[PDB]
Amino acid sequence: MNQVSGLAGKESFILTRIELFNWGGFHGLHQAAIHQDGTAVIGPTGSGKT
Amino acid sequence: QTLEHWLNVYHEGGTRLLRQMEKEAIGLWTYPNKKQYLARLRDFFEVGEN
Amino acid sequence: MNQVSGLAGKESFILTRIELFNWGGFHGLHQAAIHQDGTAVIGPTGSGKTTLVDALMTLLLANPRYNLASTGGHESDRDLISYVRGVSGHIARPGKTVTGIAATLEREGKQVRLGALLWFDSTSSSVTDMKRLWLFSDNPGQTLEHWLNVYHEGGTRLLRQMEKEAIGLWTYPNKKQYLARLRDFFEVGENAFTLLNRAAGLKQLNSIDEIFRELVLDDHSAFDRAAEVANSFDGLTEIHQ
Amino acid sequence: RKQEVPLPAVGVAVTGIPAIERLRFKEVDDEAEQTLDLSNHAADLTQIGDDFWDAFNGLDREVLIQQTLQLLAKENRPVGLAELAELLPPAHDLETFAVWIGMAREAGIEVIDSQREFAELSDGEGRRWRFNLPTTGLESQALMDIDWE
Amino acid sequence: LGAKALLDPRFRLEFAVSVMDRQSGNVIESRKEIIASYVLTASLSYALSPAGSRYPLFGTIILDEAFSRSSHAVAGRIIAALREFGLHAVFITPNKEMRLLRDHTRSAIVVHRRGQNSNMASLSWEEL
Amino acid sequence: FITPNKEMRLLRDHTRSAIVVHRRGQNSNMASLSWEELERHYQRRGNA
Amino acid sequence: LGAKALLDPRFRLEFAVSVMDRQSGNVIESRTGSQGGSGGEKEIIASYVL
Amino acid sequence: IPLEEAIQSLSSILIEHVSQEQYDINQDNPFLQASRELREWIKRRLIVER
Numbered sequence: 001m002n003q004v005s006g007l008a009g010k011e012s013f014i015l016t017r018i019e020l021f022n023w024g025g026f027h028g029l030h031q032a033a034i035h036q037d038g039t040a041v042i043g044p045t046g047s048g049k050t
Numbered sequence: 051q052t053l054e055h056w057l058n059v060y061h062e063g064g065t066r067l068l069r070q071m072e073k074e075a076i077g078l079w080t081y082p083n084k085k086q087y088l089a090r091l092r093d094f095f096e097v098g099e100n
Numbered sequence: 101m102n103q104v105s106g107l108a109g110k111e112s113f114i115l116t117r118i119e120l121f122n123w124g125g126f127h128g129l130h131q132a133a134i135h136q137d138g139t140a141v142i143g144p145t146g147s148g149k150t151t152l153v154d155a156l157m158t159l160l161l162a163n164p165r166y167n168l169a170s171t172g173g174h175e176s177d178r179d180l181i182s183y184v185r186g187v188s189g190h191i192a193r194p195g196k197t198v199t200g201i202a203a204t205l206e207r208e209g210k211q212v213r214l215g216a217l218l219w220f221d222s223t224s225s226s227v228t229d230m231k232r233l234w235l236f237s238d239n240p241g242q243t244l245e246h247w248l249n250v251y252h253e254g255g256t257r258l259l260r261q262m263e264k265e266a267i268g269l270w271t272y273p274n275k276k277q278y279l280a281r282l283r284d285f286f287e288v289g290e291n292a293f294t295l296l297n298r299a300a301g302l303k304q305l306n307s308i309d310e311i312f313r314e315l316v317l318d319d320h321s322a323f324d325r326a327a328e329v330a331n332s333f334d335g336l337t338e339i340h341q
Numbered sequence: 342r343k344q345e346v347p348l349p350a351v352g353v354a355v356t357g358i359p360a361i362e363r364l365r366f367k368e369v370d371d372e373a374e375q376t377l378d379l380s381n382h383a384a385d386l387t388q389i390g391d392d393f394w395d396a397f398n399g400l401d402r403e404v405l406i407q408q409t410l411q412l413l414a415k416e417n418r419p420v421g422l423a424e425l426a427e428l429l430p431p432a433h434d435l436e437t438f439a440v441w442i443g444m445a446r447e448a449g450i451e452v453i454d455s456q457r458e459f460a461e462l463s464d465g466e467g468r469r470w471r472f473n474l475p476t477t478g479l480e481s482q483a484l485m486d487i488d489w490e
Numbered sequence: 491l492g493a494k495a496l497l498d499p500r501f502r503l504e505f506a507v508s509v510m511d512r513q514s515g516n517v518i519e520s521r522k523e524i525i526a527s528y529v530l531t532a533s534l535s536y537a538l539s540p541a542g543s544r545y546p547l548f549g550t551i552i553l554d555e556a557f558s559r560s561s562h563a564v565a566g567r568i569i570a571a572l573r574e575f576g577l578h579a580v581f582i583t584p585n586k587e588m589r590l591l592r593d594h595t596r597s598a599i600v601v602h603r604r605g606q607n608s609n610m611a612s613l614s615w616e617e618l
Numbered sequence: 619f620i621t622p623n624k625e626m627r628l629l630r631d632h633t634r635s636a637i638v639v640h641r642r643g644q645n646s647n648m649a650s651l652s653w654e655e656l657e658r659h660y661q662r663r664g665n666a
Numbered sequence: 667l668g669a670k671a672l673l674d675p676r677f678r679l680e681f682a683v684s685v686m687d688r689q690s691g692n693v694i695e696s697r698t699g700s701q702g703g704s705g706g707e708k709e710i711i712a713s714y715v716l
Numbered sequence: 717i718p719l720e721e722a723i724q725s726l727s728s729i730l731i732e733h734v735s736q737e738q739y740d741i742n743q744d745n746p747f748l749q750a751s752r753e754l755r756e757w758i759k760r761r762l763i764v765e766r
């Protein structure tokens with residue numbers, strides 16, 4: 001399942017961290033990494049994902 | 051350079067300092083209008099707006 | 101949780117059973133049961149659950165919003181004739197086809213049943229090529245498969261003749277008079293079953309106000325009056341000019 | 342371009358008579374600083390409801406399907422649902438029963454709703470139950486002829 | 491919305507709901523999910539109750555996708571309210587949030603569709 | 619992948635991380651977790 | 667729909683995706699239009715195209 | 717070329733020619749140089765922008 005991810009990170013640029021501040025409901029500073037094997041945003045419906 | 055650094059500099063000094071920082075720094079660029087920044091981006095990533 | 105459910109049946113009529121025949125994908129006789137303390141219909145997405153909901157609803161309104169939930173505003177691709185034909189997108193039952201539906205209930209342990217018998221005698225599917233009947237029974241001695249056999253003995257006249265043979269049985273060729281009979285049997289105004297249709301396809305609860313509007317209350321907006329208002333005003337304008 | 346044309350002065354506006362009184366001065370007395378916020382808002386997940394952890398803990402049809410196939414290879418015979426419960430008592434009972442009937446019907450095998458079989462199962466809090474089940478039979482052949490995706 | 495405000499009776503007024511103390515009748519709240527379900531059950535029960543009848547004579551209600559779009563506590567409140575209104579209820583879901591319904595229901599009907607064919611298999615259970 | 623609560627089961631296997639977001643009325647938070655740590659957090663909630 | 671069918675380029679064309687055999691020019695199966703209730707294949711084809 | 721894209725690309729190009737010792741070397745702001753020279757070429761009617 002997860003073995004196909006060698007290519008990522010060798011040719012292309014890869015998002016790996018989004019820092020936010022006073023953006024939407026995210027009062028104050030926030031930070032979240034993204035694992036270069038593919039990451040998923042999870043949360044209760046209506047919880048700032050979009 | 052990180053969002054923390056930029057916010058800290060902005061608090062330490064208004065827009066004047068924010069625009070002055072570019073020339074002091076290296077590997078950094080600022081764009082008081084968006085389309086300039088988007089052109090910089092599209093150039094760096096070699097892809098059209100489409 | 102459910103031990104307080106003792107009021108069901110003892111106090112009011114509740115759903116107990118359903119039967120089907122040559123309806124949708126349910127080719128031939130097919131059946132289900134219902135529990136007093138409640139039940140749930142389950143299955144993989146797009147497997148026949150809302151199909152059963154529509155099959156039930158066909159007998160309780162002038163016309164329900166067939167496939168109301170999954171459409172999400174989309175028009176009712178499903179309806180009576182397509183269900184009798186078993187449509188998907190290849191018609192399951194072309195030519196001459198027969199069909200039967202029923203539901204059941206109980207109050208004080210005494211049974212009630214609804215149903216309707218449909219069939220095209222030709223491959224065409226006009227609204228009149230459909231030969232239809234509706235039924236209502238307050239006697240346990242009635243079931244859907246028995247009605248199918250009765251039809252196999254003869255046409256609608258036989259479904260009326262067995263009504264005359266038994267007591268606590270009613271059948272009708274026109275939907276409105278059957279609906280009126282059942283509604284009198286429950287004192288129910290048809291707006292109640294309209295609300296039932298509103299609920300039977302409602303998705304997530306958006307807001308209490310919008311819920312009042314879209315479920316509790318009939319729309320009945322007067323835009324139909326505005327058209328003739330404008331036309332009559334233009335007519336007056338003609339003479340005035 | 343910047344030659345001065347001789348046009349009359351009309352719409353002649355007069356403004357800004359420089360009365361000394363109109364002056365006012367920088368009121369820097371608003372000294373209160375706006376505090377900085379550079380705190381990492383480390384979050385604990387225990388504040389969102391069980392509706393999320395439940396979907397986290399839910400059943401997976403793949404794992405149970407493979408386990409049932411292993412069992413049916415072991416027994417190598419038709420087996421009823423109650424025996425399937427006894428051999429493989431689940432945790433999420435009703436869903437597992439639904440999956441079992443789903444396989445039964447994926448094989449095209451008849452499920453005689455008209456004749457029944459029964460079982461008893463405990464749950465995660467020690468409470469016990471009874472299941473009125475329909476009669477049918479699963480077979481390793483049935484589910485290897487069928488495939489899953 | 492303006493055309494609704496002019497031609498739609500429903501838009502001539504804004505609906506509201508208030509929580510009441512049972513004994514003294516004092517207002518605790520003047521105003522979602524927990525209340526809307528009770529609202530809907532109330533509306534159906536009343537619409538299905540003949541004049542002068544304490545109960546809804548036709549006490550059965552259907553809910554498509556009843557709880558595939560609601561939290562656990564919300565569906566618990568739904569079933570509680572249905573008990574308050576003496577309404578037998580039926581629910582539909584595509585094999586999701588099944589723990590709740592299995593806990594709060596005593597039977598179910600599974601439907602699977604093999605190509606153009608469909609069929610039914612009923613089931614039941616109880617606690618001990 | 620942005621995902622709802624449903625179908626998270628399948629997605630858990632075919633990825634290596636999760637950005638969990640929080641709703642607190644008129645406030646929100648967000649944290650970076652791996653499935654290994656989210657499993658342990660679920661266990662901690664089960665214990666407390 | 668009529669007006670776009672005239673004055674919008676990308677509305678004069680119907681689109682369909684035909685699966686090809688690597689070892690033959692034949693079409694294994696073509697996907698487009700209303701499926702009628704089954705979409706286990708349409709989903710993957712459309713996602714793949716996107 | 718959209719004007720902003722053009723000035724960005726021209727600044728990137730002129731960055732290359734900073735090595736030409738005998739032609740107007742800029743090593744403080746090539747972006748402003750690109751802007752000024754695009755304007756100049758517009759003055760010569762080499763390039764007209766609409």
Ligand SMILES: Nc1ncnc2c1ncn2[C@@H]1O[C@H](COP(=O)(O)OP(=O)(O)O)[C@@H](O)[C@H]1O
Nearest residue numbers: 024025044045046047048049050641643644645
């Ligand atoms: N127009 C809005 N309506 C409701 N909430 C809003 C709105 N705009 C911003 N919000 C705030 O930002 C969020 C926007 O909705 P969101 O939860 O991000 O969508 P989803 O959860 O489906 O991804 C809300 O959770 C809320 O905190």
Ligand SMILES: Nc1ncnc2c1ncn2[C@@H]1O[C@H](COP(=O)(O)OP(=O)(O)O)[C@@H](O)[C@H]1O
Nearest residue numbers: 145146147148149150151170177178182183703
């Ligand atoms: N009368 C009809 N018209 C069109 N399609 C129908 C009709 N009857 C059944 N179908 C098919 O039968 C299946 C019904 O599954 P169902 O679970 O009731 O729908 P959903 O899960 O989307 O709410 C669907 O695959 C549907 O396409």
